[model samples]
Target: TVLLEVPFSARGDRIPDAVAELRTREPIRKVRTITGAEAWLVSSYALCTQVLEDRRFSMKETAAAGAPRLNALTVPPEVVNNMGNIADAGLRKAVMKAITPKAPGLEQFLRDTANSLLDNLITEGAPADLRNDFADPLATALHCKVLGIPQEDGPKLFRSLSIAFMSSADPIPAAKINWDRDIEYMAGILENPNITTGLMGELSRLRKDPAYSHVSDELFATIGVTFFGAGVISTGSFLTTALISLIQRPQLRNLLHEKPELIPAGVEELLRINLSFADGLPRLATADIQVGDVLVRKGELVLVLLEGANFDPEHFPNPGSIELDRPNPTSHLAFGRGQHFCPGSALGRRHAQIGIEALLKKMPGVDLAVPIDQLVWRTRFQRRIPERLPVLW
Candidate 1:
């Protein structure tokens, strides 16, 4: 069999046809990574769920020296188990409490921010780049509010993301540089009495708490830097792709525009079909395990293809359609499952829902300004995004 390179394409609007063929014929198959490390690419719904749920499939172990790597570490290797570390350090609840989407005034803030962004775009005229002007900046501002940091500080950190989220086969020098700088900035936030509102404020208190004295300052700072970077990228990427999915279906878009009550369900269907994650979610097995037809050996790498499971015809019939009443709308692995399930899922979902609601109301006739094929897709990055989603209202 040809050793196919992972990630067939970075196009957010499309999933390569090869993925469905792989899922049908060879769900658990060997593939070559960008790093030249061979890995089991688990594509079917059952196998992907199996790999994700099994504790022995270790995320941290993927970073072990000389291990078969899916991609080089964007943040430090230790940061892979960020949520685990926070839970172990007894900081999980506080951090979770800080980022809940239902936090007072957050939904309103999203509305205000989204409307304000739309206003700016309208004033500037047609063919506005939605990814940069709308989705990304909205994500940045949302994270800034969640982190209790100055909105003014958002852009510098946002700039780091293009380099910070690089999934290069080799170490990216700039990722580390930005990581250190962002950490220092977070550390400074912890020290600042003014930042007494969001995640950073709560972490600031925890940093001084006697019970948590043993906790390292590095972890504290990592939480801030990582949460900010991760949340911004995740929310922005999903919203951008979700918009693309919506724009391609004007009938559904108009329906949602008329009945905003259905936006969440529409968001779920969009999430199910989203091509946001460019590559599979990686894990290193700690012990041999049977995943479908393959005996994935201990110490080998495994890649859980989200779209593979999501687009599985067996699980989600008519998988490409945006049907709001699907039986298992929330069952897709978009936020992942098991141990490393995204902690910011609530915030991320609300961000998309509110942004979509606001956009449809603001630009009811929004459509791609350029031909779909003309949009440049981002590559070698954590998220599959159009470099610029230029649209007209």
Candidate 2:
């Protein structure tokens, strides 16, 4: 049995040298997870797209008993099973309406939130941690605003959500505790008459209507946490990562600062190269399926290496280089692919775009406070984010 240890970090910031090697040597090969579970690692872009789009590879099945998994923090079975239910016709329609760029005040709300957070960072001056002071607060605020969660409650709620979402070896117990607390917190907010606006408010009102009465408080609460949790963590990570990338390249930073119009393209390029999630999407094969040269057996787990695929040189020529004007920057699988594509893709991109623009405009001279090699990175089975992104002017 061939086994490749995950998070191939041989070449930091670049796609782990091992993953780059596997793209050609063994795009789909059995590997032992950090949790010591055996799983197939799909490294090539073509195979990753195939696995993601194939219905036979079931995400829900990954939660089954004795299933090979990346770690304990993987979404629980109950949540996974109920995901489709949470996206029922009426609820989906309401959510889509609530999250769109045209959603009442969403665009301005994001801008205001970004500037407000940056204001605090500027006030504190340079030699500040951008991740906590800027990215974290901005993401929490925007997520709270959209979810009808109280801004006052966002900080504490975000902390709990983070514990629930990102855990180390044994995350199940801690995740359960935090998950319950999060549900309770969201449920209280949903019932509050004082909070009669935003997505949660809309969901609260919708649940009472005859057409959507089946939307239980449990369902509503789950959806709220899912949106806020996923939105905040991933968006926050991307925002900080994009800023770090910009700070590392003074020339690129100057170009972006000089040409504000290029920020959006730069953000897209950042998404392409950023290692948002440390691990790949986990799915269980319903039957024996061929992934490149390997025939994965029925009920076997397959880890789709989105990072590896994004760095696949065949698809992304000069994969190691950051080109803001890359011909197909959006082709990257940083957001995953297929039916389960990130629902907040546009919102996430916009958050990074607006946040970057705001930062460059307000603090054009900002640069990394410490050597890039000295920056600490947190890597769990699911994600890799800076422990603290310190910056100085």
Candidate 3:
């Protein structure tokens, strides 16, 4: 069996060389995960799209017993299987409606939050950890606002979510503690008198409707956890990564400063090259499926290498280059596709755009406080992000 250790870390901010090697040699090849599980690694953009869109490739089924997996934090089969039920669907719809960019005051809320966070960062002086001071707080505040969680509660939720999602060693026990604490906190919020605002408030109202009355408080708590866990982890990391991209290439920062209108397009390019979830997304085949020349058997795991697909030269010309003016900047699989596509993509992108614009506007001369090689990266999970992004203006 071939061993494909994830997060190919040899080249900073680049797809693992091994993935590129496999993309050309064996686009769909059998490999072993760090967890000792057998799985098929899909590298090419075409095969990844096919597998992602095929109903036979099931994320819910991946939670079943005997399913090969990469992480121990897999969603319980019961919740996963019940995901699209009437009540669940209603809850999802309600949350989606609340967080959409068009949601009343959402855009302003994000902008205000970004500016306020950057204000604090500027006051704190340089040599500060951007991840700690800016990106994490901004992402947490926005997610909390959208979900109706109190701003004071944001830090605790952010810490717990980070531990739950990113802890690599001795993960289960610590993850459980944080997970349970987060759920308790969210449940308490739902029971409080101040529950008539944000997504939680909307969900509270939706819970009374016959259409969603069956939804459990525990499930509502789970959705709250999901909002923070998924939303903050990725959004925060992506923001920091975008900043790092600019700081590394001072020229890019100058370009954006001169033409501020290009920030949105620049963000798309950052997402394209950003290697957030390096371990690849895990899915299970519900039936025998043909991916390219390989057959993934039913119940087998398939890790879709998003980084590989994003960097595939055939799909993206000059895949290694970052061109803000590149045509089809949104073609990257960073947000994924089909049913599992990120519901918060628009909101997430807006967060990055606003974040970068504010950072540059406030700290125009911001640059890495240390050499790029001196920066530390956390490799606890598939998402390889800077441990602490220190900057000095």
Candidate 4:
């Protein structure tokens, strides 16, 4: 069989037909990553879960020497285990504690920001882009507040994201430069006494604690940079795509718009179906493991396709449609699984929920300004997002 490319397609409106075909006929098959490395692509719900929940399918090991790679490293090699480093530094719980979107005034901040951004779009009239004008800016504003960075610095961080999350076949020198510069900027946040609130505030306080003084400044800075970049990109991408999903299904959109209480459940259904991640989640196998028909060997790369599992008819009947009644609505691998479960998932969910609720309230008549086929989807990027989400209310 010809080795299929790791990311089968970049279109956000629909999953490639080939993915569903492979999931049924040969769930675990060999594929060539963009980096020109051979890897096992696990596409079934059960096998995708197996690869992620299994400790030996190592995220850290994916960057280790001699391991087949899924893509070029965008961050430093060690940054693959940013969570591990946080745990080792004794700041994992602290970081987790601070990531709570339930923090005092944080939810208000999201709601206010979402309303404010939508207000501006309304004032600007039709064809205002939700990507740049709303979603991206809302994400940037929240990340700035969430990380306790200067709000003025949000644009700088937002600009670096295009390069920071590039899923290229080769190393991105610009990404490397941006990573170092972002870290430096985050380090300055730790030194600023005025930054006494948010994740970095908690991190800064702990960095100076005598018991945790052993933690280095670089680690602290990297934590802020990595968390900021990851959360912002993922949240922005997810919301932009979720909006599309809602726009396409006016039945679901109108229902949720009328019954605001169902927005959370609606968001989960949206997440289960959103095709945000263009590339599968990559991991390096540390031991031989049987995944469906294929045996993933030690040091081999494995790409877990979320849509494969989320859309599998066997798991969720009529998987293509958004039905909030599903017994396992939250069972999708949107935020992933196991040891590296996305720490910011709670915040992400709330971000999308608030963003959608505000939009529905502000523009109940919202629809795509241009036809879906006319939209320009971003390729060679980690997330499946439209370059510009042009819309009219």
Candidate 5:
């Protein structure tokens, strides 16, 4: 079968068609890039979800085995291993405690921080790129603050991390700087006896426990990096994209503006519809498995297409349209599922909710600064962010 390399801008509209076709005929198919590496793409909701939740599919070992690498650079095995190892029950519970809803004053602090950030953005006026001007900084701020890093250093930290994230080759230098900042930042925070609050404070106390003593600075830094980077990019993209969508559809904006409660639901709908990451979820088969009728060899790469599963009509009717009150919308794989699911989903959603609500309230007339066709979509990478989403009120 021919493999198509569609531009990232077109993927949002084309993903549903691909998912539908695969679900109907070839649920599992060989996907070969022009570069010649081939992997099995699981495009259906049931099959993708099964692959995601299956014990046989191991993300860690897939990276470790150094399977024919894809894309410009191979992510260090540490990245995949860290993500996979988080699935442990004990570790998950501990990490969740630091981020969960029950965590003392998380919602209040987040709202306060969001509103404060928006206030600063509004002070700067319109003709802004919300992704950079507002969302990115706010997300990074929240990440640093929640983890006990000083807000003043947030920009520096983001610069370092962005270097690593945006790197096309030899991410090691960027990663080194990024990881070094995190290590120093977390270590400094842990040593600060006066700053006793949030996740870092808790982690510092935990680090003293003999059993948890092995929770080194690098480990904490990894958590900080993952939470910070993931939170910033995804939340920024969601906020900016949802805003652009609303501006394009005035009626939807009016509806949301009038009934603010719908903001949360709208966030979910946006999360469901937007194609966030295109690199796909990389997994390794533990044993030979059949995806529909196709046999997937054991130890082969299984790439689960999140956009595909999310838009599957079998689960979501007219999956292309954004249904504000879509039933059981929580099933959206925007956060994946099971143990590997994002622990910070609630926080991320809340960030999006607050960001959208703030924009709607302050800049009710914000509109795209350019025609839809003129907008630049992020094409060189996995994320679906516009190169610069300019808006004017």
Candidate 6:
């Protein structure tokens, strides 16, 4: 076992190399953090995905069994229920449908909303923080629209949800408080017949089924809250970082400018490189498992360092460099692999792609208003974001 102290603000490029080294030299490595929790860091991509999909690695079971409290403290057990259970097929199905193609005119709504937001930014002028001004509101709006949350309450709701998600230490109490408030809020909407149909409405309707009736409105609210936290932060972070990348990689940016159709493809490359969520998704091994050549025992903590796995040279040749149409760029694990794979991935990518495309077209001269090093990356939790991405167009 090796002691590796990974700085909270470690750059994305260096992480994969570190993981590759650790994976080859010390697969089951003991890592102690400044926070004092000692845990195992699993760096191999194959192993990481294996742990992700294997029923032996259980999210719900981990919360129930309560393994060694290494790493950061998460939302409390009571509030943990608000995270929604992926293991439940009906809950998963309803949530998936909310963002899926069946949702009437979702794509157009997104595109229209994106264009409107872009215009607002262009009109507002530059030397503005994209995170605060544009990306944040855009993501919040999307969450609000899809979840049936009032637009007026979007900011407050987003704040509560975000704090619940990103507060690394002693979050359980706060999570419970927010969880209760959100439940009440959504329950009121569901009870009111006048409330227009949205994700929650659909969820409420779904709950009428004898098989699905077991799902509470709180569970549905949890789904909405999850998107508010994960969707908004991840989308905003990717939007800001993608903008920065475009500025840094002028050749690619110029190509995108010349060929608008290239935006979608370029967005994939951006997703691969931007490294949205810095800390890997955590998992608890429920049974003896083999990941790559490393054997992980039951009840051990598994950290899937996505940023590292995304850049593995073994999985991706010249993993650091971005090719326009990088053949088989699927090596990236910005979204984790397997069952726990993010269902909102497609929607997230579209949101980001439309955002970047709109920005490039409207703010043709968009560039970082400050030096790259000056931009701050938020490291308090899973989200990889800039404190303020100041830019001029």
Against the true structure, what is each candidate's TM-score? Answer: 0.99, 0.95, 0.93, 0.99, 0.88, 0.89
Rate residue 202 of model 5 by lDDT. 68
Stretches of candidate 6 off by over 4 Å are 6-20, 33-35, 70-89, 209-211
> What RMSD does each model have against the real structure?
0.9, 2.0, 2.2, 0.9, 2.9, 2.9
For candidate 4, give the lDDT: 0.90
- In model 2, where is the ten-residue run with the lowest total lDDT? 7-16
Residues 131-244, model 1: lDDT tens digits? 999999999999999999999999999999998888799898888888888889998899999989999999998888999999988999999999999999999999999999
Model 5 vs truth, CA RMSD? 2.9
Q: Candidate 2 has what TM-score?
A: 0.95
Poorest 10 consecutive residues by lDDT, candidate 1: 1-10
lDDT against the true structure, per candidate, is 0.92, 0.80, 0.78, 0.90, 0.69, 0.67
Q: Which digits, one per residue and each the tens of the lDDT, describe model 4 over residues 1-393?
A: 667777888898898888889999988998898878999888899999998999899998888976788778898889998999989988888899888898899999999999999988888899989899999999999999998888889999989999888889889999988988888888888999999989999888888789898887799999899889999999999999999999998888899889999999999999999899998999988889888877778778899999999999999899988888899999999999999899999999999999999999999989999989998999899999999988887
Ranking by TM-score: 1, 4, 2, 3, 6, 5
lDDT of 6 by residue, 1-393 (tens): 556654345343223445556767875566654445555676666666666778677665555644644344445454443434644535666667776534676667667777787777777777877788777887777777777667797888777745555636334567678867866777776666655567777766776667776665466555666666677777777777777777888888778887889888888878777766666566677788777656778887667767556666677667677777677765567777775677778877877777777777777777789988787766655566677888887
Model 2 scores what on Cα lDDT? Answer: 0.80
**Number of the candidate with higher TM-score, 4 or 6:** 4
| Residue-by-residue lDDT tens digits, candidate 2, 7-49 | 5652225566667777898888888877788889898999999
* Decoy 4 TM-score against native: 0.99
Candidate 2 ranges beyond 4 A from true positions: 10-12, 73-75
On residues 1-393, what C-alpha lDDT tens digit does candidate 3 reach at each position?
A: 557665456233545567778899999888777667888888899998898888788877776766676666533455554435424456666777777767788778777887887777778777878888889888888888888877898887887755666524233677777767777888887787787888788867776678766666678777777776788888998888878888888888988888889999889988988877757777889888889998788889998888778888899888888887777789889999777888789889988988888888877888999888787777665466778888999
